[PDB]
Each structure stands twice: as structure tokens, then as C-alpha cells.
């Protein structure tokens, strides 16, 4: 205030402002606000931490975090979600960040309430016959970002919600796969054997690599640059603007590439249920006969899936193959 006050008195001696003098006085004010703006954000608010932390939780930018959450959540989500589930889900969401080591000590976000600032919502997306679809996460913004975006006029908030479902739906089938296969791998439950085992394991592996690359390679890498600029130099308003542009691309992407892969994936998920149901029953004659039928059908479905999977993989490598693009048109 005193340095700006002096400056206005200087300016007043000039009869008509001269561009050079006006610029030198601005370049001084600009350095003082900017220097102050970096500390306020960076030290107190712990802005770099919170943005990274936000990516990990809201946009599923941490795989580990999602694994601990699905694992706790599983019982609660298997049945329909009502009044009591919402509360239980927010506890598991909160406990999960501490378990994954992102609120375990104070080196991590714990000094900020941004990451306790997240609450799980249950709405009525897809099927109300299971709790699995209905789960969403909601993030409630804190000053000064709340001037940008808010729960009243929530265009950006809507975007984030769309993306979250798409990622989560792949993750949901993924979870079911890992546990289903895992039970069978464990002992106590010839050539019939081991053949059933590789096919089941092969498919779980395949889903995990795909999931890994989308989280890691796209979300985490683009986000890291957004944080990196902000800490280095800018304001909140620039981050949201850049964020929106990111989200839209992801939406575009979802529709073109992930329509042959979810068609294959829902079917594969039916096949794993068929295999476990049969499997549990095994240790006379009857148990053997069921096993021979289960083994033939299971390979056949798997072989078809795999053939479709290969074409989608070929597109992934190319970053654009014409054929996938057509298939996605046919389905929609």
C-alpha cells in the first residue's frame, strides 16, 4: 500500500501519462503481488500438494487408492445402496486414503482439508438393483477456487462426474475378476485342471494392463504438468479452464474406443460367474459331467473375446485405426 500510494502521487505530476513511466510502476506492483500469490498458494494452502492429491482421489489418478477402496466397499456395494450405505461408504473412502499413505502422516496432505473435503454420494445411476453402479464421489471446492466453480451452476462439476463413472465401470468389472480368479487359485476348493487356470488368469492380466496405462499414462502425466506450472510461477482460474479441456477430450475418447471393448467385457464377466459356480461344486460322477460341459463352453467364449481384444489392442498401438472407428459407429 505505501509503494502504490507513492506511485500514484508520481503519476499525478505527469500531465498526461507516458507509457514508459506507467509500465515501470506496474512491473514493480506486478512483482510484489505475484511473489505474494505464490507463497499464499504454495506454503499455506499447500496448493501443489492439494492439486496432486485431488487428481489421485477424484479422477482415480491413484490405482492403489482405488484397489483399497473397492476392497472395503465390496460388501456394502454388493447389496442396494440406501441411507445407511452412504455413511458407511464415506468412512471407507476416508479410511482408504490413510491406508494408501496419502493422509498417514503430515508429509502427505493432512494439513489441508481438501482430501477430507471429499464425500461419497449415492445417486441412482444405472441399476438400483446393485449399489455398484449408484456410487459416485463428489468434491466440494474451497476458497479461492470456489469463486471459479461451485455447486450452483456446476458445469465443471458435471464433467468430472461423467469421467469418474467410465473409469470406475472398468474398475468394477476388474474387481470382480480379481477376486473370482483369486479364490480358485487358492488351494483346497490333470489336463482339465491348469487349462481352466491359465485362461482365467490371462484375462485378469489383460484387463489390469489396460487399466494401468489409462490412469498412469494419460491422467497422471497431463496433471503433473498442470501442477508443475502452478508451483513454478498464475492463478486458480487458469487451472480450471485447462482442466475442462482435459475432461472433454477424455469424454470424446470414451465413446470412440471404449464400443467394442465393453461389449466383449460384459460377456467375459458372465463367463467368469459361470466358471466359479461350477467350480465351487467340485470336490461324484455328476461333478465330473458338469465339469466337461463347463470346460468346453468356457474356452469357446474366451476364444471369441480374445479375437475382439486383439483388434482393439491393434488400434491402441496405432492411436487410430480405421477399423475400430467403423465398429464403434455400427454399435451406436
Amino acid at each position: 500500500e505505501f509503494s502504490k500510494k507513492y506511485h500514484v502521487l508520481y503519476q499525478s505530476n505527469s500531465y498526461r501519462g507516458i507509457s514508459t513511466n506507467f509500465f515501470e510502476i506496474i512491473n514493480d506492483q506486478y512483482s510484489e503481488i505475484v511473489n505474494h500469490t505464490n507463497q499464499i498458494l504454495n506454503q499455506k494452502f499447500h496448493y501443489r500438494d492439494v492439486v496432486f492429491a485431488l487428481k489421485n482421489i477424484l479422477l482415480m489418478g491413484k490405482s492403489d487408492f482405488m484397489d483399497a477402496l473397492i476392497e472395503k466397499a465390496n460388501d456394502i456395494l454388493a447389496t442396494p445402496s440406501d441411507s445407511l450405505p452412504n455413511y458407511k461408504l464415506t468412512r471407507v473412502l476416508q479410511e482408504a486414503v490413510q491406508l494408501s499413505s496419502l493422509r498417514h502422516l503430515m508429509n502427505s496432505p493432512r494439513n489441508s482439508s481438501v482430501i477430507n473435503g471429499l464425500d461419497a454420494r449415492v445417486l441412482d445411476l444405472g441399476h438400483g438393483s446393485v449399489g455398484w453402479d449408484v456410487f459416485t464421489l463428489d468434491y466440494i471446492l474451497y476458497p479461492p477456487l470456489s469463486l471459479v466453480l461451485n455447486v450452483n451452476r456446476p458445469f465443471g462439476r458435471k464433467e468430472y462426474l461423467r469421467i469418474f463413472n467410465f473409469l470406475w465401470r472398468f474398475k468394477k468389472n476388474n474387481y470382480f475378476y480379481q477376486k473370482e480368479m483369486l479364490k480358485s487359485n487358492d488351494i483346497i476348493r490333470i489336463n482339465k485342471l491348469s487349462r481352466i487356470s491359465i485362461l482365467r488368469t490371462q484375462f485378469q492380466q489383460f484387463n489390469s494392463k489396460m487399466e494401468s496405462y489409462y490412469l498412469n499414462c494419460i491422467i497422471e502425466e497431463n496433471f503433473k504438468e498442470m501442477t508443475r506450472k502452478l508451483q513454478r510461477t498464475l492463478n486458480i482460474d487458469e487451472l480450471e479452464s485447462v482442466h475442462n479441456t482435459f475432461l472433454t477430450n477424455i469424454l470424446s475418447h470414451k465413446l470412440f474406443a471404449t464400443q467394442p471393448y465393453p461389449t466383449s467385457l460384459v460377456l467375459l464377466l458372465n463367463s467368469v460367474y459361470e466358471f466359479v459356480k461350477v467350480y465351487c461344486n467340485l470336490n461324484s460322477n455328476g461333478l465330473l459331467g458338469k465339469f466337461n460341459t463347463n470346460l468346453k463352453e468356457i474356452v469357446s467364449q474366451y476364444k471369441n473375446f480374445k479375437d475382439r481384444l486383439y483388434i482393439f489392442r491393434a488400434d491402441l498401438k496405432n492411436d487410430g485405426d480405421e477399423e475400430l472407428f467403423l465398429l464403434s459407429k455400427s454399435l451406436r
Binding site: 492403489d64 499413505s101 498417514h104 480379481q178 488351494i187 485342471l193 498412469n216
Partner: protein
């Protein structure tokens, strides 16, 4: 996640690999040699660790959740070192007669059976302390008296006690350029346990291994500590994807599915490049991603006897590459994607396209040249050879009668040698099935 793993250290070998392991972890997670918590340092955002493998004391001393079993020499060596803080005396359970550096399986089996309770008490405390127990890891040699006999007794009690928890072993199989012929007795008796009571055996075959310790590290005279440092570098690298968040190779279920492809074939062979990683004695180890990776496929750098690639099966059931970078992530990322699509193994009906990658950051907080590393864990049909050479060795020693005396003292041999026969019949069935995967006759529908 943060879920606990309890580490079991057995015999001379386990204690020696284990001490190096905690040392190496410690540099990495930025904590002192006694495990003291350093405050401005990070170990809870860079890693999950300091709760999966470690536990906290009321005086804020992290100590690894490990139970040490063996005789006296090895427990005495570690306290004399500064690496004392990684161990605690309550964690130490010590015999005085199950000792032998060499093969003496029976002597070990028998002692375990006497002191079943004293050990089970150790085990129960470590389980009671767990929050979310993933499973157990046994570090041992199946070439000791103590590592071999006792370690396999404990696997049978753990199988019985818990069936759905993972049991992983890093097992050193006894060398076949050795100077002892009792190697066969240990390998056969243990191998029964290792297939059924455990779900994974990462085979370290000492003949190949010992040469890796000899050539790379350039040791002036060979000792147990030396070879055991080589094993600690490989072991630390294999766990990298677990220990770091943002990888779904941290959950218990997802590691098991990827790694274990049959409850009967779950014999793993390692390859690692470069082998030095914090114990560099070599002029250089700094190299581009491509050299390391291309070399990871090669059976020439391997710690177990998978022999060479000519006159041997080339049929990989699974291949897992575990990736470390401190050089551009995008070059490495693109490369892994190409490597799966190219299909280095042969493939038939049984399986196809089984190449998986796990991605992890490597930490330069270890003494390095700013090198990039990677590890291969693979399930390969060539592993049958190792069992085969044991079968041949077992027959010759049977005929000679050599040093049966210690063995009869043990429970298994006073209860006839019928158990051994029964095992032999089962084992051959396992090798024939592994051979079949090679061809197109395992999957036929």
C-alpha cells in the same frame, strides 16, 4: 496397500539375505541404519512402506516385521553390525543343534517338531499384530540343515493353519557342482512341501547363481555373505511395484493372479539386469532401457538353471517384467507396449500373448550411476530340467547308502521311505504336464 506382510527368516541363508534386504530398503525409503524415523524425509508418500514391512515402537524406532529362526552364528553377527536395529531379541528364536551349513534336512525337521510351540508363539504374536494380513514370505535355502528342514516343517503347519493366505518363497535349490551328495535328500523331501504348502517358489539354483556372484561382484574369496548380497539385490527389485502407490500391482489378489497361472505350475525363474544395484564393484552399470530389457529375455543372465536357449524349451507360460526408470518414462512406456505385441516366446493353443508389465520408479538414493534396471519373473517350461537332474542325483546316493544316519534320526525316514516314492510318482506327473504346455495339446477345445 499398507497391509502387512510378515517375513520369515530361516537358517543361515535367510538371516544373511534378510539383513541386506532391510539395509537396502532403508536407503531407499530414506531412514537410518537402525530404522529411526526422520521427520522432514518422506517414506509415507513415496512409499506405502513403514507399515507393510515395518512396525513402529513407542520410542519411534521402525523395526521390520520379521521372525528370525536359526542357530547362534548368524543372530550374533547382525547385532555386532550397525544393522542391529532391524532385528529385535524377541523376534529371535534360537536353536543350538539344528545347525549345519551343509545338507542335513532331517536334523532340522526333527528340531522343529520339538520346539513347535515356541515358534508357533512367535508366529501368533506377529499375526495378532497385523491389521490387514496379505500373507507370508519365507527366505531360506533348501541347501542348509537349518534353512532346509525347519523351513519345510513350518510350511506344512502354515498350510494347515491358513489355506487362503499367500505363501511365497524365495528358495535357494542346492547347487549341482557341489561337493556333497546329500543334496538329493534335502531337495526331494523339501520339494514335496514347496509345491503343495506354498503357492510360489522362485527358484534360485546355486550352480548358476554362484557364478553370477563370482563374475560380476568380483569377490576375492567366496563366503555365505557374498552370494547372499547378490540375492538381496534381486529380491528388493521384485517388490518395487508393491511398494509404490499408483500401481494396482499393490493389491494381494492382483499379484497372485498375474504371477501364478496354475496351482501346480508355479515354479518361477528370475533374470535381472544389471545385477549390482547398491553394491557396485564394476566400472559402469549405466545403460539405455533397450540393453537391459533385451537382456531380460535372455536365459544366459539368470540366477537359476534354466540353461541356454538351444536344445531347451522356449515356451513361456507367462512373462512379467518389472520396470525401473530414472530416465524418460515415455521411451520405456512405448517400448513395453511394442514388446507385448511382438511375442518373443512361442505360443500354441494353451495360452497366447502372456506378457505383462509393471511400471515402478527407481530411486537414485541407492548408490548407482543413475542406472535404469528391470527384473524379469517368468514361468517357463525349461524349469523341469532342475527337478530332473535331482531325480538322477537321488538314485545314485540311494545306491551308495551315503550318510543315511542323520536322516533316520528324523521322523520321515523312521516312518519308511514310502513317502518319498509316493512323491516321486506325483512329481513326474507334474513334469509331464509342464512339457505338454509346450505343444498345442493342453487346450484342445
Amino acid at each position: 496397500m499398507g497391509g502387512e506382510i510378515i517375513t520369515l527368516q530361516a537358517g543361515q541363508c535367510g538371516n544373511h539375505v534378510g539383513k541386506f534386504l532391510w539395509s537396502q530398503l532403508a536407503k531407499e525409503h530414506a531412514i537410518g541404519t537402525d530404522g529411526l524415523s526422520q521427520l522432514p524425509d518422506s517414506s509415507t508418500e513415496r512409499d506405502d512402506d513403514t507399515k507393510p514391512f515395518f512396525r513402529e515402537n513407542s520410542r519411534n524406532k521402525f523395526t521390520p516385521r520379521a521372525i528370525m529362526m536359526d542357530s547362534e552364528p548368524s543372530v550374533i553377527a547382525d547385532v555386532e553390525n550397525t544393522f542391529r536395529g532391524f532385528f529385535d531379541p524377541r523376534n529371535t528364536w534360537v536353536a543350538s543343534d539344528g545347525a549345519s551349513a551343509g545338507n542335513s534336512w532331517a536334523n532340522g525337521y526333527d528340531i522343529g517338531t520339538r520346539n513347535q510351540d515356541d515358534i508357533l508363539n512367535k508366529i501368533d504374536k506377529e499375526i495378532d499384530s497385523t491389521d490387514n494380513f496379505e500373507g507370508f514370505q519365507l527366505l531360506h535355502s533348501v541347501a542348509g540343515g537349518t534353512g532346509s528342514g525347519l523351513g519345510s516343517n513350518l510350511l506344512e503347519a502354515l498350510c494347515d493353519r491358513y489355506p487362503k493366505k499367500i505363501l511365497t518363497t524365495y528358495s535357494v535349490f542346492p547347487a549341482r557342482s557341489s561337493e556333497v551328495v546329500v543334496q538329493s535328500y534335502n531337495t526331494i523331501l523339501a520339494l514335496r512341501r514347496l509345491i503343495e504348502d506354498s503357492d510360489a517358489t522362485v527358484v534360485f539354483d546355486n550352480a548358476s547363481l554362484l557364478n553370477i556372484s563370482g563374475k560380476v561382484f568380483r569377490n576375492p574369496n567366496i563366503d555365505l555373505q557374498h552370494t547372499n548380497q547378490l540375492i538381496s539385490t534381486i529380491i528388493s527389485s521384485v517388490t518395487n511395484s508393491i511398494r509404490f502407490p499408483s500401481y494396482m500391482y499393490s493389491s494381494m489378489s492382483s499379484i497372485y493372479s498375474t504371477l501364478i497361472p496354475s496351482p501346480e505350475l508355479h515354479f518361477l525363474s528370475p533374470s535381472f539386469t544389471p545385477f549390482t544395484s547398491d553394491y557396485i564393484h564394476d566400472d559402469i552399470a549405466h545403460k539405455g532401457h533397450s540393453s537391459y530389457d533385451v537382456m531380460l529375455d535372455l536365459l544366459d543372465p539368470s540366477n537359476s538353471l534354466v540353461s541356454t536357449a538351444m536344445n531347451n524349451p522356449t515356451y513361456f507360460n507367462v512373462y512379467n517384467t518389472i520396470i525401473g526408470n530414472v530416465e524418460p518414462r515415455q521411451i520405456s512406456r512405448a517400448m513395453t507396449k511394442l514388446q507385448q505385441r511382438i511375442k518373443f516366446p512361442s505360443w500354441s493353443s494353451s495360452a497366447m500373448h502372456v506378457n505383462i508389465g509393471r511400471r515402478s520408479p527407481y530411486l537414485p538414493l541407492q548408490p548407482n550411476e543413475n542406472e535404469v534396471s528391470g527384473m524379469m519373473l517368468s514361468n517357463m517350461s525349461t524349469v523341469v530340467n532342475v527337478f530332473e537332474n535331482a531325480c538322477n542325483t537321488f538314485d545314485k546316493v540311494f545306491a551308495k547308502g551315503a550318510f543315511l544316519n542323520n536322516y533316520n534320526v528324523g521322523d520321515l525316514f523312521q516312518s519308511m521311505q514310502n513317502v518319498q516314492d509316493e512323491f516321486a510318482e506325483s512329481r513326474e506327473v507334474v513334469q509331464s504336464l509342464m512339457e505338454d504346455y509346450v505343444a498345442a495339446e493342453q487346450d484342445s477345445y
